[PDB]
Amino acid sequence: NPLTHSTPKNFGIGQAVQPKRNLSRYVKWPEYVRVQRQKKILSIRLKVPPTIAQFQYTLDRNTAAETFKLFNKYRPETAAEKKERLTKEAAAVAEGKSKQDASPKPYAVKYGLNHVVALIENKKAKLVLIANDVDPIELVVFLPALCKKMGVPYAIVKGKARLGTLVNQKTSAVAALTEVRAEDEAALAKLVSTIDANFADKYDEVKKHWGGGILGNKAQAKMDKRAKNSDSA
Amino acid sequence: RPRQYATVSKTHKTVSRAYGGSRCANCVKERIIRAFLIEEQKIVKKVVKEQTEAAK
Amino acid sequence: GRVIRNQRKGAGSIFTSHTRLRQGAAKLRTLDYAERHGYIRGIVKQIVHDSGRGAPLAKVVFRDPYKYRLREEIFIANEGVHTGQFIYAGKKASLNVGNVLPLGSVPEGTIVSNVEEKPGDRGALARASGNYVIIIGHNPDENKTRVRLPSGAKKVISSDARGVIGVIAGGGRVDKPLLKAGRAFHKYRLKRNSWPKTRGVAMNPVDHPHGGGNHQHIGKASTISRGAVSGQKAGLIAARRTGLLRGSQKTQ
Amino acid sequence: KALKVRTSATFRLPKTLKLARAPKYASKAVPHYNRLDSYKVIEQPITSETAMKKVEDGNILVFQVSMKANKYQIKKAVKELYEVDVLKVNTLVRPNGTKKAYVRLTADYDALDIANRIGYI
RNA sequence: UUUACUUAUUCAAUGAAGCGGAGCUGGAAUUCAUUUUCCACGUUCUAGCAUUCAAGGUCCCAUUCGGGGCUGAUCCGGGUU
RNA sequence: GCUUGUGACGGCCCGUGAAAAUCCACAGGAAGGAAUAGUUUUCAUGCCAGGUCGUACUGAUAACCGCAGCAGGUCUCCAAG
RNA sequence: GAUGGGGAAGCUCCGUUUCAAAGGCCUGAUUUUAUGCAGGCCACCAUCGAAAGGGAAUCCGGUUAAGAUUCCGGAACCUGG
């Protein structure tokens, strides 16, 4: 409506040098990026066995939230309160002279792979969380089989980093409750019911099932045009 | 020689048209003529295409 | 014995090509979006001599679709193209001399040159003076195209393989008697050190298998196996026939 | 759940922080003194008869000079020591490996007075 | 023995820019439930020019020297081809 | 006239007879800018500085190589009647 | 002929733009901003290699036992600031 004018650009072939478009699909990424992406792809494409891919069936987010609430109640000690209780115990050994009777029993969460495996073997663990992570997967593939052989409820949860956050490390790869105060036993039992429904009770069919065999979107479309309209329409 | 064009002023290195010390005057004339006439025939192609396509 | 001429050519110290005055490599434009969905227009600016090459070259100038600049390309000139001519390259380009089309888009009987073996190599076949391939059929299923090459061989190429329309210029070159050793000298001092050629029969036995003798003779069959090895391959290699060619060859 | 937008198809190094030097110990204990000061720059006058002729005539002093020295340094040293303004310095390397400087003073100063002040003639 | 798959391996190209699928919009076509499909989906008388997150349109902030988003330039998948 | 440079031309080639640093111009229209003084440091003048190394001589029937002050060999410029 | 990478028991070889996340030019920000930050620009990617190839700019007269387009006198030019 002013003097100002419209000059539309014809961004067709053979005229009007093209505009800046999003080219994230065509960038020459670095080699570590391509390694990890193609590693994801390849592990998806190949027929994975059953004992791997008994992972990939991690725990739902609501159940996981409840689980991590329960565990974050029974977080471990840190250096600050450890030094606090060390002071308390150095005092009590002087005044009370009561060794291993000043501080109460801790009900912390048990972590560490060798520790937790030994606990599972001696049947002292009441609930075991396992990471869908680790890359040296041999560290953790044998744990469902153990928990099943020994009668322990196990759950494959997402995040060794979650486990590390609750247990005051970066990564843990496992976590376990053996002892629990007489206030959360009912919650723990509810969790065990859900978890055994999802993981331990499905263990036979999961042991039978073979994973992977997935195709790319391009190849899947090629299949869905090839095998579709051989007799479809 | 090339680095003397830096010593010398600009009236020595350019004439007062568009494309002064770069193109000949007759070359400039040709490209002006060409520009104007092709930009007219562009309009003509547009309206011919419109009158043809809008027939149906 | 001693290492022979044909052996040490491969080390190629003084047998490298002489490439100073060559204007560049004759390459088709990179196969990109325009050239595989539409056409792109270019201008022939120069038609220029290329040393060590009887065929002339065309300096064609195109626009870059993605950045404001002019990208220049070096085509082999088809016979008939001229300065100030527009060159159209792509899938939807018209059938005119100098244009770069896919061999599926062209029809049968079409005469092309600088034609890709497989898409993207930017020209491999029918590139020397006077040469062309003929298209002699399409197989539109599996997008192939059967063609006659200047040797007489039939080949099957992708329909997406591009080819420039017409015959390459410089034809008639080998009709003229070169007529003197100096002209052969000047020919080859712009190509490589392949000239003059001495005969094995004329040299000593260390220097060649045909060498030696109280007469100039070979002594053994000059036809030598494909399974011979380097130093033993200095005649007619894997010769399935020999002698004056009589009658119809290209038997099929 | 959002993605970056990249107009180029090229990935280059992120220009991360270039942090500076902050050493816990010096690279060497003590700074070296000036390696080429004035008394190292001028070694000896040159009292050949040609040089004395040039003193009398051209207002030119002739000095033996360090091979590591240049014209800037020679001018600076002469002005510093003999309290003299300086025009053109010429230099050569002799066939014995020492440097020879022909220092031309300005018209105000008299190289012969400067020379008999230096002590030689 | 033959055949099929892509991911291993191999070849080639590129400043790893426009792949695959599905859609809007035109044409033919059969339509029998409104489809069943297919082709195109901005440049060809001229040795011209084509560039500065594109003008325009619209919504914000604020319009005070202005700045931002979307659309213009279809969506999804990020498998460079 | 001789030597040399240069120009415009002609002939020859299946031979058509280097590159890069470097300098300029053009296109473009970013940005900035009017008089109570602002832009021009491609006009004129004026100010300062210009480092390092080489530099003598022979260059050949005695200054090089040839065991040597060897009738040998060893690249080029100028060029009188 | 390095680098990146790859070969080779290894001394080392290939290769010089390559299967590499191989950098800088400016702008604003400004009087916390040192040079970061809001931005936009670019793509190529060592180095060596010619006192006869390319190349910023000097001439005269005089002067020494022996130096001179280098010194003296006079008259100029280029580059950088």
Side-chain angles (χ1 to χ4, degrees), chain C residues 6-164:
Chain C
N6 69 48
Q7 285 183 278
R8 60 191 210 255
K9 265 164 179 270
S13 87
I14 52 146
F15 303 100
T16 53
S17 167
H18 312 159
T19 47
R20 165 163 74 103
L21 314 159
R22 302 189 139 104
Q23 288 293 309
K27 281 185 181 308
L28 290 177
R29 192 169 159 286
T30 295
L31 197 143
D32 75 316
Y33 179 84
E35 207 162 358
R36 67 191 168 78
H37 285 289
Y39 55 87
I40 186 159
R41 178 258 295 277
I43 315 105
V44 185
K45 306 294 283 188
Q46 297 279 123
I47 302 184
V48 71
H49 190 62
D50 195 54
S51 288
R53 188 181 284 155
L57 299 178
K59 288 189 168 300
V60 189
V61 66
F62 294 90
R63 282 162 65 237
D64 195 43
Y66 311 110
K67 210 226 175 88
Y68 167 79
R69 74 203 170 172
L70 274 65
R71 282 212 280 112
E72 189 170 326
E73 280 78 12
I74 301 165
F75 281 26
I76 320 186
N78 294 122
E79 193 175 353
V81 307
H82 64 262
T83 44
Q85 181 176 331
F86 294 130
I87 290 303
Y88 291 91
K91 181 176 171 229
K92 289 202 175 157
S94 86
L95 193 75
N96 312 129
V97 159
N99 290 4
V100 186
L101 279 80
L103 262 71
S105 293
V106 311
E108 188 266 331
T110 302
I111 292 149
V112 307
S113 50
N114 204 27
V115 55
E116 301 180 314
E117 261 171 339
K118 42 201 195 315
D121 68 5
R122 296 166 77 184
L125 321 166
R127 283 158 64 77
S129 65
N131 299 134
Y132 57 90
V133 316
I134 309 149
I135 294 96
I136 52 171
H138 306 262
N139 208 23
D141 60 304
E142 70 160 32
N143 76 336
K144 289 275 157 66
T145 308
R146 35 189 302 262
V147 304
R148 180 91 67 205
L149 320 184
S151 65
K154 307 189 282 285
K155 198 181 212 157
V156 68
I157 52 154
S158 187
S159 297
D160 305 321
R162 303 168 287 168
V164 73

Side-chain angles (χ1 to χ4, degrees), chain A residues 67 70-71 109-110 116 120 124-129 147 152-155 175-178 187-189 191-193 195-196:
Chain A
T67 296
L70 177 57
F71 279 61
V109 76
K110 304 295 173 217
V116 165
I120 289 153
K124 289 167 89 185
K126 305 294 179 69
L127 189 140
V128 177
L129 306 191
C147 286
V152 173
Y154 74 94
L177 291 172
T178 82
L188 185 69
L191 260 68
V192 167
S193 291
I195 281 164
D196 273 17

